Design an enzyme around this catalytic site. Sequence first.
Site, PDB file in Angstrom:
ATOM      1  N   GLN A 171      55.429  55.754  11.829  1.00 12.68           N
ATOM      2  CA  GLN A 171      55.778  56.740  10.820  1.00 12.68           C
ATOM      3  C   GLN A 171      54.535  57.225  10.094  1.00 12.68           C
ATOM      4  N   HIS A 172      53.336  56.894  10.594  1.00  7.72           N
ATOM      5  CA  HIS A 172      52.104  57.399   9.997  1.00  7.72           C
ATOM      6  C   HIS A 172      52.162  58.903   9.891  1.00  7.72           C
ATOM      7  N   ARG A 173      53.017  59.516  10.696  1.00  9.75           N
ATOM      8  CA  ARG A 173      53.366  60.909  10.553  1.00  9.75           C
ATOM      9  C   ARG A 173      54.881  60.958  10.436  1.00  9.75           C
ATOM     10  N   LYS A 230      59.392  61.886  16.022  1.00 11.72           N
ATOM     11  CA  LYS A 230      59.814  62.779  17.083  1.00 11.72           C
ATOM     12  C   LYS A 230      60.121  61.939  18.310  1.00 11.72           C
ATOM     13  N   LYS A 253      62.530  57.512  19.851  1.00  8.98           N
ATOM     14  CA  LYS A 253      63.308  57.780  21.053  1.00  8.98           C
ATOM     15  C   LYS A 253      64.699  57.233  20.799  1.00  8.98           C
ATOM     16  N   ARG A 271      54.153  78.665  42.020  1.00 10.14           N
ATOM     17  CA  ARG A 271      53.590  79.936  41.592  1.00 10.14           C
ATOM     18  C   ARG A 271      52.074  79.886  41.726  1.00 10.14           C
ATOM     19  N   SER A 314      61.338  84.405  13.537  1.00 11.11           N
ATOM     20  CA  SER A 314      60.853  84.753  14.865  1.00 11.11           C
ATOM     21  C   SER A 314      59.373  85.096  14.782  1.00 11.11           C
ATOM     22  N   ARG A 341      42.518  71.593  25.188  1.00 17.67           N
ATOM     23  CA  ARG A 341      41.790  70.926  24.115  1.00 17.67           C
ATOM     24  C   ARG A 341      41.932  69.409  24.157  1.00 17.67           C
TER      25      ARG A 341
HETATM   26  N1  LIG Z   1      63.239  66.378  28.453  1.00 16.13           N
HETATM   27  C1  LIG Z   1      61.822  66.650  28.276  1.00 16.13           C
HETATM   28  O1  LIG Z   1      61.456  67.518  27.551  1.00 16.13           O
HETATM   29  C2  LIG Z   1      60.794  65.813  29.031  1.00 16.13           C
HETATM   30  C3  LIG Z   1      61.248  64.536  29.740  1.00 16.13           C
HETATM   31  N2  LIG Z   1      60.310  63.464  30.010  1.00 16.13           N
HETATM   32  C4  LIG Z   1      60.625  62.392  30.920  1.00 16.13           C
HETATM   33  O2  LIG Z   1      60.665  62.995  32.423  1.00 16.13           O
HETATM   34  C5  LIG Z   1      61.622  62.359  33.055  1.00 16.13           C
HETATM   35  C6  LIG Z   1      62.888  63.216  33.395  1.00 16.13           C
HETATM   36  O3  LIG Z   1      62.818  64.604  33.164  1.00 16.13           O
HETATM   37  P1  LIG Z   1      64.154  65.133  32.357  1.00 16.13           P
HETATM   38  O4  LIG Z   1      63.813  65.800  31.046  1.00 16.13           O
HETATM   39  O5  LIG Z   1      64.907  63.852  32.117  1.00 16.13           O
HETATM   40  O6  LIG Z   1      65.188  66.078  33.218  1.00 16.13           O
HETATM   41  P2  LIG Z   1      66.464  65.375  33.983  1.00 16.13           P
HETATM   42  O7  LIG Z   1      67.117  64.290  33.156  1.00 16.13           O
HETATM   43  O8  LIG Z   1      67.500  66.426  34.310  1.00 16.13           O
HETATM   44  O9  LIG Z   1      65.800  64.714  35.346  1.00 16.13           O
HETATM   45  C7  LIG Z   1      66.429  63.674  36.044  1.00 16.13           C
HETATM   46  C8  LIG Z   1      66.446  64.056  37.551  1.00 16.13           C
HETATM   47  O10 LIG Z   1      65.868  63.129  38.265  1.00 16.13           O
HETATM   48  C9  LIG Z   1      67.048  62.290  38.994  1.00 16.13           C
HETATM   49  N3  LIG Z   1      66.709  60.895  38.886  1.00 16.13           N
HETATM   50  C10 LIG Z   1      66.951  60.103  37.841  1.00 16.13           C
HETATM   51  N4  LIG Z   1      66.474  58.887  38.126  1.00 16.13           N
HETATM   52  C11 LIG Z   1      65.930  58.934  39.348  1.00 16.13           C
HETATM   53  C12 LIG Z   1      65.307  57.980  40.120  1.00 16.13           C
HETATM   54  N5  LIG Z   1      65.027  56.580  39.858  1.00 16.13           N
HETATM   55  N6  LIG Z   1      64.849  58.296  41.319  1.00 16.13           N
HETATM   56  C13 LIG Z   1      64.994  59.557  41.792  1.00 16.13           C
HETATM   57  N7  LIG Z   1      65.606  60.493  41.034  1.00 16.13           N
HETATM   58  C14 LIG Z   1      66.070  60.174  39.815  1.00 16.13           C
HETATM   59  C15 LIG Z   1      68.151  62.606  38.366  1.00 16.13           C
HETATM   60  O11 LIG Z   1      69.378  62.421  39.208  1.00 16.13           O
HETATM   61  C16 LIG Z   1      67.902  64.092  38.049  1.00 16.13           C
HETATM   62  O12 LIG Z   1      67.984  64.868  39.160  1.00 16.13           O
HETATM   63  C17 LIG Z   1      62.016  61.205  32.111  1.00 16.13           C
HETATM   64  O13 LIG Z   1      61.159  60.165  32.271  1.00 16.13           O
HETATM   65  C18 LIG Z   1      61.822  61.895  30.752  1.00 16.13           C
HETATM   66  O14 LIG Z   1      61.916  60.924  29.617  1.00 16.13           O
HETATM   67  C19 LIG Z   1      59.020  63.492  29.361  1.00 16.13           C
HETATM   68  C20 LIG Z   1      58.416  64.857  29.049  1.00 16.13           C
HETATM   69  C21 LIG Z   1      59.323  66.030  28.683  1.00 16.13           C
HETATM   70  N1  LIG Z   2      69.286  79.423   9.317  1.00 18.73           N
HETATM   71  C1  LIG Z   2      70.096  79.528  10.517  1.00 18.73           C
HETATM   72  O1  LIG Z   2      70.812  78.665  10.862  1.00 18.73           O
HETATM   73  C2  LIG Z   2      70.047  80.751  11.404  1.00 18.73           C
HETATM   74  C3  LIG Z   2      68.882  81.691  11.146  1.00 18.73           C
HETATM   75  N2  LIG Z   2      67.792  81.355  12.011  1.00 18.73           N
HETATM   76  C4  LIG Z   2      66.553  80.870  11.479  1.00 18.73           C
HETATM   77  O2  LIG Z   2      65.299  81.771  11.963  1.00 18.73           O
HETATM   78  C5  LIG Z   2      64.652  81.128  12.899  1.00 18.73           C
HETATM   79  C6  LIG Z   2      64.924  81.762  14.305  1.00 18.73           C
HETATM   80  O3  LIG Z   2      64.256  82.987  14.545  1.00 18.73           O
HETATM   81  P1  LIG Z   2      65.122  84.269  15.161  1.00 18.73           P
HETATM   82  O4  LIG Z   2      65.195  85.344  14.096  1.00 18.73           O
HETATM   83  O5  LIG Z   2      66.505  83.757  15.483  1.00 18.73           O
HETATM   84  O6  LIG Z   2      64.507  84.920  16.563  1.00 18.73           O
HETATM   85  P2  LIG Z   2      64.908  86.398  17.230  1.00 18.73           P
HETATM   86  O7  LIG Z   2      65.188  87.393  16.125  1.00 18.73           O
HETATM   87  O8  LIG Z   2      63.747  86.918  18.053  1.00 18.73           O
HETATM   88  O9  LIG Z   2      66.228  86.336  18.238  1.00 18.73           O
HETATM   89  C7  LIG Z   2      66.051  86.749  19.576  1.00 18.73           C
HETATM   90  C8  LIG Z   2      66.800  88.067  19.967  1.00 18.73           C
HETATM   91  O10 LIG Z   2      68.086  87.966  19.727  1.00 18.73           O
HETATM   92  C9  LIG Z   2      68.523  89.148  18.712  1.00 18.73           C
HETATM   93  N3  LIG Z   2      68.690  88.615  17.378  1.00 18.73           N
HETATM   94  C10 LIG Z   2      67.830  88.835  16.380  1.00 18.73           C
HETATM   95  N4  LIG Z   2      68.247  88.222  15.286  1.00 18.73           N
HETATM   96  C11 LIG Z   2      69.380  87.607  15.605  1.00 18.73           C
HETATM   97  C12 LIG Z   2      70.184  86.845  14.820  1.00 18.73           C
HETATM   98  N5  LIG Z   2      69.994  86.527  13.422  1.00 18.73           N
HETATM   99  N6  LIG Z   2      71.289  86.317  15.317  1.00 18.73           N
HETATM  100  C13 LIG Z   2      71.599  86.536  16.620  1.00 18.73           C
HETATM  101  N7  LIG Z   2      70.793  87.295  17.406  1.00 18.73           N
HETATM  102  C14 LIG Z   2      69.673  87.835  16.888  1.00 18.73           C
HETATM  103  C15 LIG Z   2      67.559  90.040  18.717  1.00 18.73           C
HETATM  104  O11 LIG Z   2      67.901  91.208  19.592  1.00 18.73           O
HETATM  105  C16 LIG Z   2      66.278  89.295  19.183  1.00 18.73           C
HETATM  106  O12 LIG Z   2      65.469  90.090  19.934  1.00 18.73           O
HETATM  107  C17 LIG Z   2      65.143  79.661  12.804  1.00 18.73           C
HETATM  108  O13 LIG Z   2      64.224  78.940  12.139  1.00 18.73           O
HETATM  109  C18 LIG Z   2      66.419  79.658  11.944  1.00 18.73           C
HETATM  110  O14 LIG Z   2      66.307  78.674  10.822  1.00 18.73           O
HETATM  111  C19 LIG Z   2      68.062  81.413  13.426  1.00 18.73           C
HETATM  112  C20 LIG Z   2      69.277  80.605  13.863  1.00 18.73           C
HETATM  113  C21 LIG Z   2      70.424  80.443  12.862  1.00 18.73           C
HETATM  114  N1  LIG Z   3      65.323  77.394  34.636  1.00 23.92           N
HETATM  115  C1  LIG Z   3      64.758  78.573  34.879  1.00 23.92           C
HETATM  116  N2  LIG Z   3      64.018  79.215  33.895  1.00 23.92           N
HETATM  117  C2  LIG Z   3      63.441  80.422  34.143  1.00 23.92           C
HETATM  118  C3  LIG Z   3      63.605  81.003  35.400  1.00 23.92           C
HETATM  119  N3  LIG Z   3      62.954  82.180  35.415  1.00 23.92           N
HETATM  120  C4  LIG Z   3      62.387  82.366  34.208  1.00 23.92           C
HETATM  121  N4  LIG Z   3      62.666  81.297  33.396  1.00 23.92           N
HETATM  122  C5  LIG Z   3      62.180  81.187  32.000  1.00 23.92           C
HETATM  123  O1  LIG Z   3      61.956  82.489  31.455  1.00 23.92           O
HETATM  124  C6  LIG Z   3      60.577  82.736  31.195  1.00 23.92           C
HETATM  125  C7  LIG Z   3      60.148  84.170  31.529  1.00 23.92           C
HETATM  126  O2  LIG Z   3      59.284  84.089  32.650  1.00 23.92           O
HETATM  127  P1  LIG Z   3      58.318  85.230  33.283  1.00 23.92           P
HETATM  128  O3  LIG Z   3      59.123  86.406  33.791  1.00 23.92           O
HETATM  129  O4  LIG Z   3      57.556  84.615  34.431  1.00 23.92           O
HETATM  130  O5  LIG Z   3      57.294  85.768  32.157  1.00 23.92           O
HETATM  131  P2  LIG Z   3      56.288  84.798  31.355  1.00 23.92           P
HETATM  132  O6  LIG Z   3      57.029  84.160  30.202  1.00 23.92           O
HETATM  133  O7  LIG Z   3      55.067  85.560  30.886  1.00 23.92           O
HETATM  134  O8  LIG Z   3      55.844  83.698  32.440  1.00 23.92           O
HETATM  135  P3  LIG Z   3      54.597  84.044  33.390  1.00 23.92           P
HETATM  136  O9  LIG Z   3      54.749  85.472  33.854  1.00 23.92           O
HETATM  137  O10 LIG Z   3      54.540  83.087  34.571  1.00 23.92           O
HETATM  138  O11 LIG Z   3      53.346  83.930  32.548  1.00 23.92           O
HETATM  139  C8  LIG Z   3      59.871  81.734  32.094  1.00 23.92           C
HETATM  140  O12 LIG Z   3      58.548  81.465  31.684  1.00 23.92           O
HETATM  141  C9  LIG Z   3      60.811  80.537  32.068  1.00 23.92           C
HETATM  142  O13 LIG Z   3      60.624  79.748  30.916  1.00 23.92           O
HETATM  143  C10 LIG Z   3      64.343  80.369  36.388  1.00 23.92           C
HETATM  144  O14 LIG Z   3      64.473  80.900  37.491  1.00 23.92           O
HETATM  145  N5  LIG Z   3      64.922  79.148  36.124  1.00 23.92           N
HETATM  146  N1  LIG Z   4      61.762  63.623  25.470  1.00 30.08           N
HETATM  147  C1  LIG Z   4      60.514  64.352  25.655  1.00 30.08           C
HETATM  148  C2  LIG Z   4      60.355  65.418  24.582  1.00 30.08           C
HETATM  149  C3  LIG Z   4      60.372  64.865  23.180  1.00 30.08           C
HETATM  150  C4  LIG Z   4      60.329  65.955  22.140  1.00 30.08           C
HETATM  151  O1  LIG Z   4      60.102  67.126  22.516  1.00 30.08           O
HETATM  152  O2  LIG Z   4      60.558  65.646  20.951  1.00 30.08           O
HETATM  153  C5  LIG Z   4      59.332  63.397  25.609  1.00 30.08           C
HETATM  154  O3  LIG Z   4      59.522  62.200  25.416  1.00 30.08           O
HETATM  155  O4  LIG Z   4      58.176  63.797  25.747  1.00 30.08           O
END
Ligand SMILES: NC(=O)C1=CN([C@@H]2O[C@H](COP(=O)(O)OP(=O)(O)OC[C@H]3O[C@@H](n4cnc5c(N)ncnc54)[C@H](O)[C@@H]3O)[C@@H](O)[C@H]2O)C=CC1
Ligand SMILES: NC(=O)C1=CN([C@@H]2O[C@H](COP(=O)(O)OP(=O)(O)OC[C@H]3O[C@@H](n4cnc5c(N)ncnc54)[C@H](O)[C@@H]3O)[C@@H](O)[C@H]2O)C=CC1
Ligand SMILES: Nc1nc2c(ncn2[C@@H]2O[C@H](COP(=O)(O)OP(=O)(O)OP(=O)(O)O)[C@@H](O)[C@H]2O)c(=O)[nH]1
Ligand SMILES: N[C@@H](CCC(=O)O)C(=O)O
EC number: 1.4.1.3
Lengths: 501, 501, 501
Positions: free
Chosen positions: C84-86, C90, C126, C265, C393, C459
């Site tokens: 919790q130093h930060r 997360k 976690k 890509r 936004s 970085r």
């Molecule tokens: N969710 C996030 O933003 C990120 C996730 N991670 C870690 O990456 C890993 C998974 O990526 P996810 O986010 O979980 O997407 P996910 O949960 O959808 O990926 C799981 C995929 O891998 C398969 N799978 C699970 N265990 C397996 C095993 N022992 N062998 C082969 N396939 C297996 C699952 O059936 C599924 O297709 C975990 O270790 C996760 O904690 C860390 C960085 C970012």
């Molecule tokens: N306080 C809240 O719960 C709500 C307001 N927010 C706050 O603002 C931040 C999100 O930034 P955004 O303005 O949502 O990005 P954003 O305005 O770029 O939304 C993406 C697209 O969806 C459309 N859009 C714009 N405003 C929208 C709105 N209020 N509701 C539905 N569709 C919209 C627009 O065509 C826009 O291009 C968050 O931090 C959140 O706290 C966004 C989610 C809910």
């Molecule tokens: N799961 C999933 N996500 C996608 C897919 N295609 C696009 N996205 C998301 O939508 C974003 C828009 O992608 P792009 O059209 O490639 O434009 P961009 O954000 O500049 O990404 P780059 O062109 O590669 O730099 C992507 O970067 C992805 O995060 C897809 O086929 N599957």
């Molecule tokens: N579960 C992912 C993402 C965590 C997060 O974005 O807070 C990780 O352990 O890296």
Amino acid sequence: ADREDDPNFFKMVEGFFDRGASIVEDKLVEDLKTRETEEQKRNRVRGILRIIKPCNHVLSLSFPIRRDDGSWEVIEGYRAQHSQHRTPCKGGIRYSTDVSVDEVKALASLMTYKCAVVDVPFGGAKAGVKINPKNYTDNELEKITRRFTMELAKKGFIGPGVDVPAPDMSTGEREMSWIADTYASTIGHYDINAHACVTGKPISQGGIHGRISATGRGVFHGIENFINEASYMSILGMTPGFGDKTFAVQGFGNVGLHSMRYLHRFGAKCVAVGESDGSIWNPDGIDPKELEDFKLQHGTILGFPKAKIYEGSILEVDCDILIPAASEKQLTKSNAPRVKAKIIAEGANGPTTPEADKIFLERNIMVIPDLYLNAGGVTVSYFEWLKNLNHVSYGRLTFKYERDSNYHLLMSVQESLERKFGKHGGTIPIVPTAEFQDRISGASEKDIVHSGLAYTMERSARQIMRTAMKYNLGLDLRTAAYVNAIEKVFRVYNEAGVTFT
Amino acid sequence: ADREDDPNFFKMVEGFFDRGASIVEDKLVEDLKTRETEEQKRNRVRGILRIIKPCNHVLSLSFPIRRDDGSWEVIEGYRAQHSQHRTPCKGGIRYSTDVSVDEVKALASLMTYKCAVVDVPFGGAKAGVKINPKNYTDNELEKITRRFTMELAKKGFIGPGVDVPAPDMSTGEREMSWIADTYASTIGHYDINAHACVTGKPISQGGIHGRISATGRGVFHGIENFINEASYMSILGMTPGFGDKTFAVQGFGNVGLHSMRYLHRFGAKCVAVGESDGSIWNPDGIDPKELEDFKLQHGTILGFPKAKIYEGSILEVDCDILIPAASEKQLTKSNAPRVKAKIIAEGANGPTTPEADKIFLERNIMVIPDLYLNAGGVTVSYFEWLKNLNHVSYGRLTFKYERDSNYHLLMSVQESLERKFGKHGGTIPIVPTAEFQDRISGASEKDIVHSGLAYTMERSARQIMRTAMKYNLGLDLRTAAYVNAIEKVFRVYNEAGVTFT
Amino acid sequence: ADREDDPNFFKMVEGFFDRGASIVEDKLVEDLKTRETEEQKRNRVRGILRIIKPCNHVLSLSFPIRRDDGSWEVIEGYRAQHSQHRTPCKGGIRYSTDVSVDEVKALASLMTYKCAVVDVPFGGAKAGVKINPKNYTDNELEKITRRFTMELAKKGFIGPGVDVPAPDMSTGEREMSWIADTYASTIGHYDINAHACVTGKPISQGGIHGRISATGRGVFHGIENFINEASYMSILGMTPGFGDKTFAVQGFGNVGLHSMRYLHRFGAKCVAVGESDGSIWNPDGIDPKELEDFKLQHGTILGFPKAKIYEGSILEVDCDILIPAASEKQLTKSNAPRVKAKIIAEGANGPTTPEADKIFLERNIMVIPDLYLNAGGVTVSYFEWLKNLNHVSYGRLTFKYERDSNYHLLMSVQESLERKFGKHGGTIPIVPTAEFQDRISGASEKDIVHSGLAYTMERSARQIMRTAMKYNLGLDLRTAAYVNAIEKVFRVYNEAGVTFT
Ligand SMILES: NC(=O)C1=CN([C@@H]2O[C@H](COP(=O)(O)OP(=O)(O)OC[C@H]3O[C@@H](n4cnc5c(N)ncnc54)[C@H](O)[C@@H]3O)[C@@H](O)[C@H]2O)C=CC1
Ligand SMILES: NC(=O)C1=CN([C@@H]2O[C@H](COP(=O)(O)OP(=O)(O)OC[C@H]3O[C@@H](n4cnc5c(N)ncnc54)[C@H](O)[C@@H]3O)[C@@H](O)[C@H]2O)C=CC1
Ligand SMILES: Nc1nc2c(ncn2[C@@H]2O[C@H](COP(=O)(O)OP(=O)(O)OP(=O)(O)O)[C@@H](O)[C@H]2O)c(=O)[nH]1
Ligand SMILES: N[C@@H](CCC(=O)O)C(=O)O
Ligand SMILES: NC(=O)C1=CN([C@@H]2O[C@H](COP(=O)(O)OP(=O)(O)OC[C@H]3O[C@@H](n4cnc5c(N)ncnc54)[C@H](O)[C@@H]3O)[C@@H](O)[C@H]2O)C=CC1
Ligand SMILES: NC(=O)C1=CN([C@@H]2O[C@H](COP(=O)(O)OP(=O)(O)OC[C@H]3O[C@@H](n4cnc5c(N)ncnc54)[C@H](O)[C@@H]3O)[C@@H](O)[C@H]2O)C=CC1
Ligand SMILES: NC(=O)C1=CN([C@@H]2O[C@H](COP(=O)(O)OP(=O)(O)OC[C@H]3O[C@@H](n4cnc5c(N)ncnc54)[C@H](O)[C@@H]3O)[C@@H](O)[C@H]2O)C=CC1
Ligand SMILES: NC(=O)C1=CN([C@@H]2O[C@H](COP(=O)(O)OP(=O)(O)OC[C@H]3O[C@@H](n4cnc5c(N)ncnc54)[C@H](O)[C@@H]3O)[C@@H](O)[C@H]2O)C=CC1
Ligand SMILES: Nc1nc2c(ncn2[C@@H]2O[C@H](COP(=O)(O)OP(=O)(O)OP(=O)(O)O)[C@@H](O)[C@H]2O)c(=O)[nH]1
Ligand SMILES: Nc1nc2c(ncn2[C@@H]2O[C@H](COP(=O)(O)OP(=O)(O)OP(=O)(O)O)[C@@H](O)[C@H]2O)c(=O)[nH]1
Ligand SMILES: N[C@@H](CCC(=O)O)C(=O)O
Ligand SMILES: N[C@@H](CCC(=O)O)C(=O)O
């Protein structure tokens, strides 16, 4: 710790539960009155029981202290919250190296049912700091408990409406006084009921009279309500009444010293006193005030002038009543056969393992269960809690009125008799007895704790004796109590929707 | 709903108010002791009354619920807070399609004065969810009430110090159990008094004994304190006492079934019972614990074996006492003439319209006003609230004391008589009567609710009777009560600076 | 799970720590520059390290949920807060039956250092719910995650300033959308930053653009910054650049599918894709779009028309780059020898055990550590968090001004050249390139996520490559990162008084 019978503590208590679960399960299905009359009742029941047994929450803490020698040490510390069908959770803080999550998960569960036995409206909790307290200076122990209070407070494991700790092994007034002061001065700063976050407090801090004894007093009342019921004494081959009995206490803590005090007073004889370094012995009798005065001066019961050191197990000492007031799992499948005593008063929390119970059952040895007997601790704490909510020293607002009211009530019996017996008949003084001049003003705090405790140790003993007769458990009072607890705790879940869903 | 006399509900109750306003207006100016003595005592009385009349707050809710069939439905729901001269607001939640802001604005106001009648320190509130409750499954009704609790909680319309709901039409224990659980598990999570946010709760959830009856018990006490006052019975040409009376209840809910039970016990005899599908009839008498057993089994009173189905209006049934325990505006300009009965006990909230009062006044028919008679509901709820604040089952701390105290008190009358009449005169047992052996330990929760209710239905009737005499209202008890209410509610505003300003 | 090398997860990561601990321990003592210059620098360092590794808090949850079939089920669920130093902590929520306190205690710790690697100001946390998510209907999974959010919220384990969850294995947008909605509608009702309690949210709920990819994008950047550093490619006998490489991903989740997309890509070719039911194979290349479109239709990668059901371990597939994106402890003492690949990109959290690192070290196989490589997840979440705090936004307030500003800036370079080259020199258009017309208005949310991520995956790779050179760790990048993490986390504790004391 034994090795032949060292079962898992939480699972041990689960064992005691599952036994009670089956025995009422029929009844629970039977008064359940729902339109899903089937085995739908049984599996609803089985489900709710499956919700009860496991703890709801456990918090595990590695927090740093800085020792006295400038160095850093990390302290392990846990607090399981078993149930919450009654907020706030209740249960003590234990300082030992034995402390382990399963041991706190176990004690917490015990507190859930223990409160259900004696109708205290708290869910079960417990907590351990995993330290040998005798290896830290008092200033270290302060920093330790205060810090432990914070980390518990921040994650919601101590609060007057949430969770109310209390003392336990190697904790007492002093520790409780700290726990209050931190939470009163920090997080609970605006909380009016702040001081009600923890019981066992010193009287000056908001504590209640007789809480330190309390648990040991309740131990007295528990043995009493049974030992004065020849229906059970006929089954032990023992005479009703304390007058002629001899007992032995393992442990000389808050539960030991006061279980010894309240029996050596109201009758029986202390034969032997244990401690984590050995026992003392004297069949002629051991005076509690002499022994305590020797433990205060010399920090050990060993070498007592008027009592020989006992070589051998304290639990096996020939006597009538064995009071384990130590840690748990003390009487096991291996030494339970050798206990050559006839009443086991579990002062400590689960000092007897389920395999010892089957021996004691066979051997017609009456184990007075931990649930019922030491519930004097929670009960007086439960009073200490209401005191800190009512913000008044009990009795204060009324004293000079059920006083004057009584003296006027008496003066009515008098004037009414004189009114009928004229002058000649004399003047007829109506005057309180000696044992009514002491109650003439009504309930003081001292008295309420006594009678309030006395009531419910008597009240809840019947509720057990009812149920041991009912389901024919005989001397299995442990199952009898868990039967009552499981029923009362279930009573809440059933009439509740069971979860916000 | 009638057609000739269907006046606006809020304005109807305002009508009852404005009548009481004028009658005390003189007195209010009179004890006002200010040195702005003019008829500007009158205008600051006229201002403070103008502040009382209208509701302080109304919250209107269109919140979505997903039904069981996966579909979405929007639920309309309202909670008017009438006054707040006493926090927290009190008042029930009603489930009906009749629910409308005016109807909740009306009931809320009634709760303000209703509490002022029976000296409960709550401001008036009420709430309606605009649903036919029979048309939703229990799991729908749960997600409806829980969600309604949230949206009320978030906008400050439910909270132990803010606003305390309770049951009403088509709501009961079950709903109240949910309202607590959401607010206990969500927004009120740290609130120690969380479960004191709502009354009518199941006993296991923090409810108080006899609250479900309560309102109907109070209905008994209300009819009683008058029907045992020949000064009014001379004016109705009826004999004092219940022993020989016959009554009829429209509605068989919480107020009906228990108004029927408590009269069929303590004397009189039910002739006819209404419900929203028709009435049953039997001049010989109807037993409540056969009819209830028939409504539980078959979900309708119609076709009761020991009572034919009645052929016309239940309100017109020949009887002594008419107890409308249904919805409001039931006795109107058009059917009020043909009511063939002598005492109207308004169990329901405002079941009689002001034009019906004009007829009943003429026809020397005593209407026992809604303010006074069903105030048993709020009164026992008011107890249920204090119970959840005192955190103790009433009576617990003292039982084995006013017990031992009394047995010692008795032992003083005894020893003192023996001390005077020697060995000559015998031994003189002083022993509780049978009645007094049941009170020997003092107030249990059952008893307090009874006597606590009994007292204030009896303390507040004899504040109405000795205002109906005072300003010569005769059988206009409704104006008599609003006179008391308007006065008590005034007093707060007068001695207050009246507003943050 | 393997059998020969299945080390304890927490202790595994502790192992990686203790390695880094020793390597900087000298330096930490070195720049410490306190009065107490001794081996008291070393033991206060050794103390602060002993405070770091163990988790600060772990919460264990047995909470009930109604299943769809009316029945009751208890759900086990944990959330360790490592440091919790930060504030705020997360870390993600994982749905698996592998979930165990040690596994969450381990991942949480990883999140602490992972954030320290990429300079995200969060402590590590976690959480796991111990369910097979397949085996519950979506409505069950909703009432599971919502309830888990409550019990976490109440005990202080989720809150915008306290602890901010995110997705992980078998959780994604949908789950995160629920976690927000409960805490926004319940406990965080008045919290303005309520929706900042959890990242990975759907864009419409406050999520940030590219967060779902993000982690896989960062996986691309991580492999890149090394594979384009011949100083390491000289040591693997491989050519700098992606253009000619071949790669295999175990797992096709959010980390797999997007690590595959971002490499297929920007150069290299997918050879094989794993999953918890088997792998597919094709040396010619596998298109991520076609595969994903297959997995969406048929819920499995197996049977891919353009690729061969691979016999054998996916980890052993001949390729250049092995990307484990599955669960942990996948490459062990027994299969690590057989990995005939050269770059290991740990997408998953700790997929390689310390004994696999020894082999990979020997076999000159470059393991890009879990700390650095998947820190794209937390980084973009860290952005998603700041977005919910800045409540805009990104880019909106400025667009039409760094736009007009640049067009005016350009118009200055132009007018200034014309001003010097008269009419004798022409008119000199100054016009944005094609690659500047797309940035002419400045940073959109899309762009910031990309460059903000791109920067710190650079970085921070730099900071690792610095340190692997410095302390001469070579291809031991894992120890290199923990060295950087241990240092950054320490510098908070050192300059702090270290604790409440
Ligand atoms: N969710 C996030 O933003 C990120 C996730 N991670 C870690 O990456 C890993 C998974 O990526 P996810 O986010 O979980 O997407 P996910 O949960 O959808 O990926 C799981 C995929 O891998 C398969 N799978 C699970 N265990 C397996 C095993 N022992 N062998 C082969 N396939 C297996 C699952 O059936 C599924 O297709 C975990 O270790 C996760 O904690 C860390 C960085 C970012
Ligand atoms: N306080 C809240 O719960 C709500 C307001 N927010 C706050 O603002 C931040 C999100 O930034 P955004 O303005 O949502 O990005 P954003 O305005 O770029 O939304 C993406 C697209 O969806 C459309 N859009 C714009 N405003 C929208 C709105 N209020 N509701 C539905 N569709 C919209 C627009 O065509 C826009 O291009 C968050 O931090 C959140 O706290 C966004 C989610 C809910
Ligand atoms: N799961 C999933 N996500 C996608 C897919 N295609 C696009 N996205 C998301 O939508 C974003 C828009 O992608 P792009 O059209 O490639 O434009 P961009 O954000 O500049 O990404 P780059 O062109 O590669 O730099 C992507 O970067 C992805 O995060 C897809 O086929 N599957
Ligand atoms: N579960 C992912 C993402 C965590 C997060 O974005 O807070 C990780 O352990 O890296
Ligand atoms: N849960 C709440 O509503 C909160 C309020 N309190 C108050 O504390 C007191 C609680 O005492 P009660 O249980 O109501 O009285 P009680 O002990 O006399 O029992 C009355 C009812 O509660 C159940 N019950 C009986 N013994 C029980 C036991 N040991 N534990 C749990 N339930 C039991 C049974 O359903 C019984 O019908 C009340 O005053 C309550 O208002 C205290 C904390 C929170
Ligand atoms: N303080 C209180 O109010 C309550 C305590 N209890 C329970 O009684 C038991 C002990 O509690 P306290 O008497 O307050 O502890 P304590 O710490 O005050 O007394 C323990 C003393 O007995 C010795 N001892 C400890 N374990 C021993 C062992 N296995 N064998 C021999 N000697 C041992 C120790 O040397 C120590 O000096 C526990 O089960 C506790 O939960 C019962 C209810 C309330
Ligand atoms: N700091 C606190 O906790 C105080 C607030 N209360 C509430 O009631 C309970 C305590 O009951 P008491 O009224 O204290 O019983 P009390 O009136 O019988 O006296 C309390 C004890 O502390 C001493 N004491 C008496 N008056 C005191 C005073 N004004 N200031 C400091 N010490 C005094 C007395 O010598 C006595 O032994 C607690 O639970 C508390 O929450 C009332 C007093 C103590
Ligand atoms: N439960 C409480 O706390 C008290 C309720 N009341 C009032 O008494 C009345 C009855 O409500 P509760 O007894 O509380 O619950 P309830 O909803 O169970 O009682 C309703 C009964 O009246 C029937 N009914 C509805 N409309 C009818 C109609 N036009 N004609 C004949 N019968 C009809 C219903 O079918 C049912 O028989 C309400 O107006 C309520 O405001 C007054 C004070 C206390
Ligand atoms: N620890 C300890 N407490 C004692 C001892 N003697 C008396 N007490 C305590 O003294 C407190 C109040 O004592 P008294 O005023 O004499 O009233 P009491 O409640 O009848 O005394 P006891 O029955 O022995 O509890 C009680 O809480 C007892 O626990 C002792 O020798 N050791
Ligand atoms: N619905 C219903 N409830 C009953 C009936 N009889 C008793 N009760 C319940 O019993 C409660 C109070 O009953 P008791 O404890 O027996 O009190 P009592 O003085 O003996 O007499 P009552 O209060 O009239 O029942 C009521 O609030 C009801 O909940 C009945 O016939 N029908
Ligand atoms: N620690 C004691 C007392 C707990 C309390 O008073 O709350 C027990 O477990 O019984
Ligand atoms: N709904 C009932 C009960 C109100 C209450 O108990 O709060 C009434 O209006 O009188």
